[PDB]
Amino acid sequence: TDPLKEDPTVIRDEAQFPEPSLYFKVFESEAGEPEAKIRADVNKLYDRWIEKYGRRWPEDGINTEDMVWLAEEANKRKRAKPRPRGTVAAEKTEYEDEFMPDRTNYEKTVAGGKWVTDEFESADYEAGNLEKLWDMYLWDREGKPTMMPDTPAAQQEGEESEDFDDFYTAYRPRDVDSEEAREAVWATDEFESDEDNTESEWAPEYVGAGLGLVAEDPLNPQYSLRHSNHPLAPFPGEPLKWASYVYPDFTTFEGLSKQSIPHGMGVMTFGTGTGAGFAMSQTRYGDKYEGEFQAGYAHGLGQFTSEASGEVYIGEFFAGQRHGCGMTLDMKPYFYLLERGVDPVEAYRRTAGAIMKNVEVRTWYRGNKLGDAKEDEVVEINVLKDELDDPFEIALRNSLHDAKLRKWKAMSPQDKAMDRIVSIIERVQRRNPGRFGAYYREDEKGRVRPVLDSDGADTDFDSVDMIQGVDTDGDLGPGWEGATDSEENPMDPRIRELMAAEGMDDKLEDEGFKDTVLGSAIINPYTGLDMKTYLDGKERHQAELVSVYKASREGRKYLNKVRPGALLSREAEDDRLARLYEQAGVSKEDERRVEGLAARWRRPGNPLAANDSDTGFETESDMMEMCDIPEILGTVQEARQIVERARMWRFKPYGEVGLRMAQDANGSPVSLMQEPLHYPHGTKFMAPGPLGLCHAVPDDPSLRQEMAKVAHNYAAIYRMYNFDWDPEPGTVQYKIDQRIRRAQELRNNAMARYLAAADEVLR
Amino acid sequence: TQQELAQMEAMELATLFDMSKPHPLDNAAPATPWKGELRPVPRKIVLSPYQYEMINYQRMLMRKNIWYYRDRMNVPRGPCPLHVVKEAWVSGIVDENTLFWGHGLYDWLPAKNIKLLLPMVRTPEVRFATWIKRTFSLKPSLNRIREQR
Amino acid sequence: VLTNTQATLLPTDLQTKRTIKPGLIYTNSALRKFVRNVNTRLNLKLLNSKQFIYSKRWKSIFSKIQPLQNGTTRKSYQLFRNVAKQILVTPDAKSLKLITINQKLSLKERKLLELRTQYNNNTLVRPLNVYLQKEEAFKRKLRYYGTMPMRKLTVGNQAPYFKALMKRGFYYYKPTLRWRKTLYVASLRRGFRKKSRKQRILVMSLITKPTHSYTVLGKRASRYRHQIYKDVLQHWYYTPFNRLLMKFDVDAFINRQPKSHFLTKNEERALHIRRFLLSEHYDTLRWYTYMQHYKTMKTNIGGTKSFANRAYNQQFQGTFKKIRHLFAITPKQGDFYTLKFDQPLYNDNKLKDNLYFHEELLTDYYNGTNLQTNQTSNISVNSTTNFVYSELFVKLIKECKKRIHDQTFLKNYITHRIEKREQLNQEQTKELNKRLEKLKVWLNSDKPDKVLTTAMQKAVNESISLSGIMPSDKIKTTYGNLTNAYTIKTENAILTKLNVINQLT
Amino acid sequence: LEDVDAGLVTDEINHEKRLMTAAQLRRLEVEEWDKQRMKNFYLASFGGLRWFDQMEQALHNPLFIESRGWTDPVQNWVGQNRTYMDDLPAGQYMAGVGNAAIRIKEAELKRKLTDVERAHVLARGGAVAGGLLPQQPTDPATLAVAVGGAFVPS
Amino acid sequence: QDRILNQKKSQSDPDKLITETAFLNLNPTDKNSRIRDGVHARRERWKQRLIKYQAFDASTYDQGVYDFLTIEDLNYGFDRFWLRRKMRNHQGPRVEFFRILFEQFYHPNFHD
Amino acid sequence: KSFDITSMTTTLPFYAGWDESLKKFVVTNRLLSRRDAGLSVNNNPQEINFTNPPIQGLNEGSFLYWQTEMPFNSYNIDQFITTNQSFYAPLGWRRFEFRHSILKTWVNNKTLIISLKNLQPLKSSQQKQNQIKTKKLVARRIKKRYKLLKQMPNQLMYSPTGPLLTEVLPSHYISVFDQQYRLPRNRYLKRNPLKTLKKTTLLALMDSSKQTNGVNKEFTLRKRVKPRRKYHRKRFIKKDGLIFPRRTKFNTNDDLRWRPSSQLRRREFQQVL
Amino acid sequence: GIMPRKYLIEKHNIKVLKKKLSQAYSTQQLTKVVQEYKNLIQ
């Protein structure tokens, strides 16, 4: 009845090695390994043999019908909707055996059927498959390609030769996708006919500190770290090692390491250079960081101390860069008075009050303090800003929020995807709507002409954005050089206009070189679209150009001598809107009077929001919500805990840092008492076993204070691993055990209610 | 009336492991009086082949380990291969409660809570010499130092 | 269930007639919808019914200096006043002296500054609204402790470098195609091992499928047969008769440990459970519990800001993907012993001492001694519970000479605006005419359901795969689907506006 | 309270919207980057100016690629780790209460339950407790239900 | 781990300057010199599927290094045993394969 | 309860020595300060300051000596390798416009003469837009200047980078270059499409256009769907080069369709560990 | 090859400061805050 007090007088386990529930399965996490594909096919064969004969073994062997069943019936990957079926032939036989002739293969093989060898080669079948996919003739009667260049490649022009399968799959009619293109050319081999792309290859997950994850196993959250390089990720190959490093600049590291990189906990002392992702001007010789390390950076909780300046920081770090809540102290008067020969008790009595009054508790964003540019009042201000709108807009946008939730709840998945596509396009058009209807013009004398603005551009896009980058408001980013303030020291005119004119010269030379190299190859033969237009992202211009030319006077003369860009029209939209008014019974005079009451009363939201529906995952905050006092106290408390655990890696016996940096009053090395069997000079009380208990501790009170503190920390470590069998009522473990027993009883009751419901339903 | 009971038990399950919200069963009396007893000694263990192979795999991972321990001043002591650990155990310098570290661990643990360390240490000669040293050297010295001071 | 701090923010005597699912997100959603509904009702009721700020410092400065006391400062003032009235003063501004001391504030900024002056001097759901926006901002702050995107590269931000080194600065073992390529290559020596494939026909869709592997003598049957042999031999390698000597040695070795160290699977599961509940109990004793946004932190992050202060196993040697089919590593697999390098235990005696204290320390050593940082933290927790017009004239006419009225400036601008623009026009017409000739080649020989580009079709299919519903088939998205979705969106917006207009009568 | 009980919580709905937006935006950005790399490769190869080789190399930079986030799963874009919940076994051992009831009912009565009676059984069983039993990973009492089924009787 | 044990001669040449101590501190991913063309060295059938590397682990005190040749592949169990299978080649496929596997290597998880 | 959860202890090892003020043999934990350990020694009343134990600077020879042993490395030496310099200053490309993919706009909607007296002062938001456009032309003149682009193989060094983001990186950053990507020839085609329309391709286009009722077809030029077979398979040569496809007949539902008439060296792989 | 790039951290800090006090609808504080930051650069 009591699960926590089962009788352990017989302990026995019945589990085999290898365990069949762990061995005979392919995991979903094993996607991206080709041997897993071979193993999945073999496991399907095992299941088929089990359901036929009760064992994982065939009666004779692998048959031909197992191969057909594996190729056709087992893997049945999902395609698009099938094309309209044809009932009559649209071609006629000209010579003999020109065409292939007009229950499944597996059950034909089961009922007696042999597979003998055909005489045609593989390239003929793949050519026929490509012709059926394109639905057009891809070779002529003489054997020469129609849609492909039939001359050998010009080696001096920079070209190489291509086979027809590569060309007719990489250049294809846009209603053929990559997977049926691979199927038509018989791309089958798991190891050599497949390559991973650069954007789709597997990588370890980034998890940061590792908090806030979804646990696959609720009792063991650490199992969710298994696909990452977190320091507590289970089984990372090589063990974490105790590293003691002296660098050539005399920076030293001591603590845990992963593949020789500081990546767990430890202590770094700074030499003439720098370390742990700190900037070069932050450190001096002999400064110290203690705490958490990830990938060589100070990352997590820690303490920075400088003896030279007296600065102490306790708090959070992100990538070596002082991010989050922190406490700052100035210990310089105490250190200064200690350096001039004052004993520490008298020095503390002189300096403690002035040190305590100057403690600072703050929020840091990225190496810099917050709270001087109104960061603590921004959220409230934005709330008040939403109250300064006219009432019609407020009522309308709240109604929009409710209606958007209601219609998203009722959508199909395909409707949901198309809705998000439309939202993305509306987000894009607020920065570049295009110039639809104003790319080309037809002036007098016919003569189609391009439409340019005052700076010669036919589009709003500029490709110098890819190098420098742009901001949220459309301003260009920082360059290679620059003044500190571009409003205090603007660029001198006569230089701005001279460089603008020379920039137009560069643009003209750009168009000339690109038209020389790429302007001759044809992408779309029906519209006259070429590679220079296509690869520059100007297909919109080409559709407008075809439409404008076909209605030009030269266009109609050429056409009878031989003999756009919008989904909806304005009139249809106005008709739909006018129809949609009269369903609700709203005349236009109702809109006139609502606009009258709106006119009589004459970035919308929280900037630090978490889940905005309209996002590009690109707009950055340059602040956070500032820490209150209890959060700062909690993180200082936890950081001191972390600093104690980090200082446990500080003197590796016979490590390099201890051998080189532990010195006497002169520069001479000392023999540290760290040897495991010898306790010299009356220090046998320090031994942790029974030999230490029978020896006398000296009568210095501060040493006994220190020993009591060390014993307290050891008991705190001990209680986390050793537990009582029968805990006394009134203790913490008794409370925990009572809650565990209650959890089992409640789950059993809920299970009994589902069994009652199942017996009621099945009747 | 079962529906009221089921909703109350579901909301009880929702806050059961909230450690800051008190529960009526946290200090309830046990059914029998407490009389705090020890777990009985199991005296008979039959291992599965799974357990045998897991012990062998762990022994393979731990073959090349160099150990370290802490003393009563929280100072780490010297490089300890297995025979140095055996010498320190026999001499009484360390015991099963001493904090240790080796490869495979993130932090310092007592020796009894580190898997397979005590079976590696406790050779029959080691057990006999540890008993000799405890009985005839350290306990008379402990009684002498208790009487003398 | 809503806390005491929320309960004094909303107006009281509200009755709840329905049971809401437990959790913080449902409570906060209900309060947020309540604030929304009250503001909507207030603005509907309000719509159905019937300031020049100056600067103290600049005004004091410009009153301090005097013209008119002599002809020199008077003439400086006259010159500046002439030029400033010509170019600096806009027609709707009424005086130069008035706008030189005007604080040029926008309408919303001066309204908010009046409101903040009114607040510092001395509605319905405004404090509740402010509280809910604070906890939204705190959730955005809490995202830094987990996985996040870093899609903006800026000067001074070291975080994307940390992400790149975390994802690529270490080797993670996984048997990809890259790993199989780096281990063993074919080393051909007699030409290619693979050859062109031979189709088969049977003797008793659009695409002809490959039937070359419908034989037991092919390459695929060989690969399957090789995998089957490897499975059989891996199982035979661990049969008991083959492992017998190992079974002796381990039986000696594991019997050197004390008998109380052997545990049942239920016992090791129970000890694991007790370990993490003891961590939760210790987490309830920190300063984090006095935060206003505590229990938003607790349900998203936990009771601490570090994983190393929680309960975890010591599994830091060996390789995860080599061990995956051999040993269970988490309890949510079957009832097995998990592979670990640490063991929790039951106490096998009564702890008469504290087990780590020396005997001489047991006489009155109960210190709790405190240093400087401890005392400062305790104190903070207890606190918790002439010549101007001439200079301006010179600067103004010098700037007016620089950026206006400069003929070399005008020359560079006009070459830019006219000559190079018509050059770009000429090259654009030349490229246009080449494209038109290429089009007329097809036009000379000639006698809705259109799909989108490949990027759009792939984006739609990947989101449908992430929809969470049972996986549907691939589709080819057209322009009719896109125009239907756009019209549905615009219909929803127009209909909710007409509903509000019907409420406004 | 009626809107919250109908399931129109803003947190879940906007999370689904942001996941779908992240997937579509990642695909569109990858395709545009592919077209630009193709253009610079052709200008370098058939044109002969090696500045376009350097532009193609700058577009192919690892810091730029993992800054764009194209190699990480899009769940990570909305702050969630990718999970594999079907990899864990679905037996009697640590199943949910409804699923474990289906396996108790499916042990005896040798007829494996189809979809419609399983749907009816779980619907009625959830109707008994008012729908307050945990169904998601973010629901509180997920940990309590996991603790309550962790012990195998013998 | 002295610096002169790893010093190479003449930048463009990646071979060690001191060949008398070149056996010390070798990783399993270091290249084997017996695979150079023109060398008539021993036959090493235990390494035939990992022929470019020195595919064994003989490491000391705390100097083990593992990069894409894992600890389990180098020195554990059936992974190590299966990687060295070319040592045990002698020097139809339809029916006799399963019959020989049933008669020779019996196991109840397949054959029972 | 105390503020500290754990006790803070000094964690220093002990040693024996002479005290000089107590004038006694003493066990203590007082070690020399880290602000001057390693820089100096005092083996006499006179003091030796050591001349080179911490390196205080770095050139190319000493960087080549200590390349894998430093805790940091700076931009000052890493300018002169282009992949490293791209790691320090990457491209700033953000906020993509998808001009290749967005081809339509859902709704449709010339040297004018202007007198100065009819013209209103401009609002401060569009004024900013004009300044932005001029700055983009200035940026093109600084960054993509072709007089420098033409002489960049052999006379000058003009590479496209973004702004410099960091001055110092951790030394193991070059490990992110270890798993190489493919050469672009292995991703894209090396051959152009057709530059002219012959007679047979015009016949094929007319047949295809007749099957689709003048809606025609659109085409796309993408990357490869597979690697090329001749590097891992023996292929039949087909030395005349003529294909003759093998398939079933075209379908519908005169109007009848007609065909138009008139030892091995090994590579060095990149996708390797 | 000595193509020069400058480290532009201070310009970025000024621009961030302007954006931060423009988000808080108080650009009347801009000259004093930017001036004291430029003084503390010195």
Ligand SMILES: O=P(O)(O)O[C@H]1[C@@H](OP(=O)(O)O)[C@@H](OP(=O)(O)O)[C@@H](OP(=O)(O)O)[C@@H](OP(=O)(O)O)[C@H]1OP(=O)(O)O
């Ligand atoms: O060049 P024109 O065709 O003679 O145009 C001029 C003149 O232009 P310019 O002085 O630049 O040559 C003025 O135009 P603005 O200088 O004001 O731009 C003028 O305006 P005012 O006489 O009022 O100064 C007026 O333009 P408008 O026709 O708008 O009055 C006028 O044209 P007229 O030939 O019609 O006088």
Ligand SMILES: [Mg+2]
């Ligand atoms: Mg945004």
